[PDB]
Design a protein around this ligand. Sequence first.
Ligand SMILES: Nc1nc2c(ncn2[C@@H]2O[C@H](COP(=O)(O)OP(=O)(O)OP(=O)(O)O)[C@@H](O)[C@H]2O)c(=O)[nH]1
Ligand SMILES: Nc1nc2c(ncn2[C@@H]2O[C@H](COP(=O)(O)OP(=O)(O)OP(=O)(O)O)[C@@H](O)[C@H]2O)c(=O)[nH]1
Ligand SMILES: Nc1nc2c(ncn2[C@@H]2O[C@H](COP(=O)(O)OP(=O)(O)O)[C@@H](O)[C@H]2O)c(=O)[nH]1
Ligand SMILES: Nc1nc2c(ncn2[C@@H]2O[C@H](COP(=O)(O)OP(=O)(O)O)[C@@H](O)[C@H]2O)c(=O)[nH]1
Ligand SMILES: [Mg+2]
Ligand SMILES: [Mg+2]
Lengths: 427, 429, 428, 426
Amino acid sequence: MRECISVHVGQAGVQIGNACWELYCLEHGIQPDGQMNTFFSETGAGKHVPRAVFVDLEPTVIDEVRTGTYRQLFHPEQLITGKEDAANNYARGHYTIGKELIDLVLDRIRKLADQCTGLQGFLIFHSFGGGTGSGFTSLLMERLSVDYGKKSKLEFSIYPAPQVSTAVVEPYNSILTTHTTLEHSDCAFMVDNEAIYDICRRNLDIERPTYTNLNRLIGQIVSSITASLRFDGALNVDLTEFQTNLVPYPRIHFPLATYAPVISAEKAYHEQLSVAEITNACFEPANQMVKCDPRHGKYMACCLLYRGDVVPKDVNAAIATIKTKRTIQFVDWCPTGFKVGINYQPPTVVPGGDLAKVQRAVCMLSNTTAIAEAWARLDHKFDLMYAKRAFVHWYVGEGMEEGEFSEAREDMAALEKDYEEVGMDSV
Amino acid sequence: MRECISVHVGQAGVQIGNACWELYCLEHGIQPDGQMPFNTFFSETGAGKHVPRAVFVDLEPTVIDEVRTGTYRQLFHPEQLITGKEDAANNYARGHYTIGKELIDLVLDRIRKLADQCTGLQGFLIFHSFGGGTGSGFTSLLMERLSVDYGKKSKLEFSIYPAPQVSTAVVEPYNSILTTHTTLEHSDCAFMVDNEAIYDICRRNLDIERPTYTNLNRLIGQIVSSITASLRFDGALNVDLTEFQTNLVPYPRIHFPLATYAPVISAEKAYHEQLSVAEITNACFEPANQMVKCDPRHGKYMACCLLYRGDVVPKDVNAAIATIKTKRTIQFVDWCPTGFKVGINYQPPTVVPGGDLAKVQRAVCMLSNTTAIAEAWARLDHKFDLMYAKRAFVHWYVGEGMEEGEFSEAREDMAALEKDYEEVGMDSV
Amino acid sequence: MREIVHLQAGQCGNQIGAKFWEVISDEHGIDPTGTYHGDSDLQLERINVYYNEATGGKYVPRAVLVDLEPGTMDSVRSGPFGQIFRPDNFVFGQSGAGNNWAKGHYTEGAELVDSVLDVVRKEAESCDCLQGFQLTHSLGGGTGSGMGTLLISKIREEYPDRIMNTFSVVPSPKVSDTVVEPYNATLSVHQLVENTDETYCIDNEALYDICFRTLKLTTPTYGDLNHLVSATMSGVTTCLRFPGQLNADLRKLAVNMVPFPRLHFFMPGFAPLTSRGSQQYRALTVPELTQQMFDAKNMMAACDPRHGRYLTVAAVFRGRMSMKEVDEQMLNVQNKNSSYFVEWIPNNVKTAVCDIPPRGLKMSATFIGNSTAIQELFKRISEQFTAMFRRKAFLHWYTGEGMDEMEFTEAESNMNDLVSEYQQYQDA
Amino acid sequence: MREIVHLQAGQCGNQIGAKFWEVISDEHGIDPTGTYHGDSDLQLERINVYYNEATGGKYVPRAVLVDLEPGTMDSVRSGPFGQIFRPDNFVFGQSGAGNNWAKGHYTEGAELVDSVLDVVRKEAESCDCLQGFQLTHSLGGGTGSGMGTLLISKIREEYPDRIMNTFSVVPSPKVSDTVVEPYNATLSVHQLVENTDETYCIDNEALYDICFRTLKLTTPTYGDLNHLVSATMSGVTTCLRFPGQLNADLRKLAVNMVPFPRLHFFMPGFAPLTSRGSQQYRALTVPELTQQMFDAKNMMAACDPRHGRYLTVAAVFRGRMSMKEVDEQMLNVQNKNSSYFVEWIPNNVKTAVCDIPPRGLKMSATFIGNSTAIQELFKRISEQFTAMFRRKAFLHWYTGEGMDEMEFTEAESNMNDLVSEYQQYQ
Ligand SMILES: Nc1nc2c(ncn2[C@@H]2O[C@H](COP(=O)(O)OP(=O)(O)OP(=O)(O)O)[C@@H](O)[C@H]2O)c(=O)[nH]1
Ligand SMILES: Nc1nc2c(ncn2[C@@H]2O[C@H](COP(=O)(O)OP(=O)(O)OP(=O)(O)O)[C@@H](O)[C@H]2O)c(=O)[nH]1
Ligand SMILES: Nc1nc2c(ncn2[C@@H]2O[C@H](COP(=O)(O)OP(=O)(O)O)[C@@H](O)[C@H]2O)c(=O)[nH]1
Ligand SMILES: Nc1nc2c(ncn2[C@@H]2O[C@H](COP(=O)(O)OP(=O)(O)O)[C@@H](O)[C@H]2O)c(=O)[nH]1
Ligand SMILES: [Mg+2]
Ligand SMILES: [Mg+2]
């Protein structure tokens, strides 16, 4: 009965939204006119109207949603498009909208939040690609910080895969994307898409995968992340026990997550599953959600959510054995510092998802220091670039000056100081 | 019983009188030929026929003539539709001095015919516009004759205000300052509803592109039922005409509240929304959903007067108004502790066929006096001052009786009223 | 109910009246034999404005038609219409004016005037209350200019409150017909700025240029040009004839126009004038194409706004229209063009809407504009009056006719007073 | 749904006003009388990029066209699609320059530049959705290159907001279509310097090197060339008219493509270029066609690759397609051929996705080769204006139409700025 509002921005966000609202509207009995718990309120007629901060600039963003199957599910005034376009960069997306699309919806956020019962958090999906997925989050996040207080805002992300990265030009967006997540910090996952494509190749038996299969998986991510406020309470935890409990400081909030649902119906419905074998497959290095090898860093504090047919005996047995495991290089200051939270619905899939009908799922969520290799790779690319004054003009026309990329560079160098100071021992 | 009389002047009165007497017949059981198969407004004959108490006075005969040949031929008694010969031609001077005083004695002889029938009368409702000639010239001459001949009765009046940006005439600022000053001493409580702000609600809220002349009148015509649903039906707290006349205006040079009707939603936007009694009190004080282009974020709320209709409950009414006063996202007064007025009534609004306002179980009419009406006059202070700087258009007005000092002696009264909105807006020590 | 008495004057006056009494007789649905023929009862209810009921249910118009040569006046009796006129209302001289203003003002035409004003009272005493008379004429020759001023100043005394309109035809240099053209229209503006409530300026050069470049005709003869252009702007008074939502008759529109009582000169225009071929391809919404007329290809007078400032502008529309798109299209036109308007008036436009379009059209509109660019016509006709009067070119047909040489120097300074008043408000 | 007004000028300009307006009039289903013929209803809503309503639902394009003499505007009017253009916006010239530049520039087209600004303010009035005028010229012309430059002049000096996509035909210097075409080329490559935003180089041999070498056509035509001069290459503008995964628009496109505000030069290929004898043996997929673009045979512009740096790259793709092998095979050839690819550029593309494929094509991978390294063919033109400068080939013609010798020596010291702006990367 605990309540939230979700955000699907950009192509990655809105196909994750196709997926995520599809699974919300299948795990509740939401049929396309309204009459058949945790995200809406009803009317005099009495019917599911999903509360909704969305932001989209384009001509034809979600007009395919409006033409789609679920067309009278979403009430149209709450879903936001304008008459003009923000041309896509961090700069133009930041600075021709701050009179246009976010400031008449600062009055619209009236209806969508007040009548929720437990006003607990927001769920924001963003991509590090371009000036909609990454650059339209910043305007939004300073609105949420300056008007909301201490509510949680959970960032789900795509990481730019460590060799291939395609949108409007990524690094000058990305540097102030994380200089944006400096401002408002709760917890921010990333996914490398290439590891998804290869686990699609090997665990799933999908030869020539496509665009669809990623976003249903990000739907199962947000499902087992924040459906603990939605389903039954055995040891009922929230995102209030997720954001407080993963990451201590606002410097490093970048975890990774390999599920029991990463395995398909054709292949791993065959395999026997138990809690130990699932958590072993979780802490194995190949299946990770961002392509960083977990052994090349320090496991800071793993904060678990649980689905499936788990038991408090065996989850604590696996927790204890993982905490003993030392090829998992643990952090120095404490082996402890976890969190667990309970639901009980076994995986029977949504249409368009290729996974199995097994009785179980486990949601690995782990913070590691082992991604500073990829962060130094991205910082290497940015300071490889900017010293030749390439792509100056259409970042500097609308507000993102030459000295502002350099202050962003030195802020992120201090953040790599925070990386090594958290990772390394102290006396 | 208690009863009152509607008066309409000009095109802007007849074209909303014919749209507000539309709503009254569909509220009750009266079919347009009169014989029904409410006795405050209507009047019985000996044969079951019903005749409303309304005078449609105007000068140009081609706007009253749709009443005499339209659907409503036999409803209005034909001695109550009063027409002239030639129009006022957008002059305050022609409609007050030269062409008006032939009709001062005919209408003031017909008003006694309706009021002799009246057992104990309450109000005379006026529907005039500040733009044209007979809506501002003859209206001013009418309200200084009603107060003389009918003593101390309540007189309510409306407006179709000259908008800031858009305007349908060039000689509008001359008429509007000349019509406020001479009715500043006779009128009791005027309603400012700007003609421009009803356009924009028809874009955002009730999304009808190209709104014609009718679809402004049906939205104004629903206010006049909501203000006078207490003289017709039974309620928990019925509020009569005198009842909210004194709860609204603090000083007798300050009588200009504003109006706001809370549910205006399309029927595609009545699927998905609660229409809750706390949800349609948020929407009255939003600056977008008002009905005059003056935002009260720059103003202090001198008073409010709320009127509710439909299926409301008097527990959640007081729960909402507490939740209003606490927040600083919406602003309030600095020295008026009570500040409010609440009315309740039972019958929900009835939708006339062909309309666009969808059928809503719970409707709110809102009335408030702000200190933010000064910016619609310090605007109008200067726009008349552009005109009168070089004596534009004065030769038309001076030829029919006015000296040129009556442009200044009505300017200086109006130029001293701005302090009357500044001396009360300042805090007290 | 609010009567209008039509006056005509000259050969140009009788080829406007024979084409104006054709358009209005199609609106009210009247046969050439003069009976009633239409379908709706909305037509006949305001027929007592321009017409008059005769016996047997006939309908005749109230028009006093003049000329000094009977050759024009016979040709109206044998036309497409013209049997509906009463034959008593035709007055005409015996010998022509000689294309001379002085002949047509003092000696040759003043015998006719006491018969012409004598018909006018008969079409005035049958009335209820007149809005006022209406004179259609030309500033070229003596039967239209000299009679036209003598008719106006003999009426404006005896019937002063009732308004007066006139439809002038000012001369043009590059399309000029008579050598005496700048010697008449300079001397008759002096008698026209005193006794007229509302004047127009419809010159033949502009009506040629809109006939080869907008309508794209091949042979624009005088019947095919007067009807489709200048006999249909006189149907701007559908407000006074048909009911509408926001209406404004002929008198309500004069008070929003003249900010000083000597500046009444207008430049009209009609909005749908596409072609025979481009009527197929355009959109009959309320656009801004002919409705931002500033690129002045469709303006019915010579001079245009680019050179000066508009004082006040009208727009009288006709059709089942929406009154939001009237008003936001008075907002793409006052701000996307910005400095051609008078600084000290912020809302220059008077609008009106009525409900019966012309035949065959969904949509129509009429534009009436006042400007400070009209002073370039009045300088330019006084350049060719100063030049010819310097050497006393064609003088002696004027000194021998009772007019002295003092009445030319009055009508040169007073002709240049109007240049002085309009140049004051050029930028200010 | 965002408006373009397809600007075009010259004897090429009103002929490229045939074949661009074939594929667009096929994409949205334009009958010869205007009223609709397409089936699906996504085609009707996005259609008001170009056309305009009328009575009876007729659609008519808003396009400013300029032609040289009245004898070339008509040979496309009496074609299959000439009945659809309303003929007010064909502007006409009594006298042309006859392979020169400025006859209709100062004095003969001074009335034509004062009438098309009674036209662009008559049909680019309603720019509520407009992101750019696709503006093209022909620069051997006099009214297509004098007025076409005075379309650039009295618009882009006022409003800098527009994208400027040139199919403006620079005549190539191997076999030029005229001896005297260099003179009005060196004012034109200069007129490509100041304002242009996304810009190809059309050298007509590089269209002439398509039909033989790739499409196997024995006897081509300009009207057979013109499917490639513009009609395939206005598959840049597709995302505003049809949606996709990663939707685009030209103003949105215009802010990734301009590093340094002048340099503007490409080398594309509409990657479907196979014959009908080589239509039997090609799989139509988003991998395979772009992997066929990379050769030395598929270009619409200038350069043989390995002959310079790759300062930017762009892309627009088609259809419901695969998100992975777009990004598997783009980097599989980016970082394998590390000799050609410049060191200091990571992520320069903008992979836009268009849902509706071009008609009759199963899957049509499209790609555009951005660069700045076209200067293996743009120093050869600029060393052949100076032949006519020193000996003064036609200046006795040139100076008489209100012209001095300071106008064409400005374009000696300021055309060389673009040569002085590859000065940083040689
Ligand atoms: N997870 C996932 N990512 C996708 C999918 N399709 C495209 N993307 C990625 O989304 C990233 C860029 O984010 P987008 O939402 O597409 O771009 P945007 O900036 O938000 O929107 P634009 O400004 O129009 O580009 C690209 O790197 C794509 O790889 C998909 O189906 N699933
Ligand atoms: N478009 C429109 N305007 C209306 C309507 N009702 C009233 N008006 C307004 O009426 C005002 C002027 O009224 P007029 O037509 O001049 O009538 P009047 O005020 O009595 O003056 P007269 O014309 O002399 O009768 C203008 O501000 C109009 O906007 C309506 O239903 N539609
Ligand atoms: N509108 C219009 N103008 C005309 C027509 N015929 C002539 N004109 C012009 O109007 C003027 C008419 O001269 P007019 O005064 O009637 O000649 P007069 O009667 O002999 O003095 C001349 O200057 C002509 O150029 C016509 O049929 N219609
Ligand atoms: N590439 C290409 N060139 C064209 C086309 N139509 C005309 N041209 C070229 O236009 C040039 C001459 O056209 P233009 O300069 O406007 O006409 P001119 O004044 O007679 O020389 C020649 O180089 C032609 O090759 C076309 O469709 N494609
Ligand atoms: Mg009137
Ligand atoms: Mg997108």
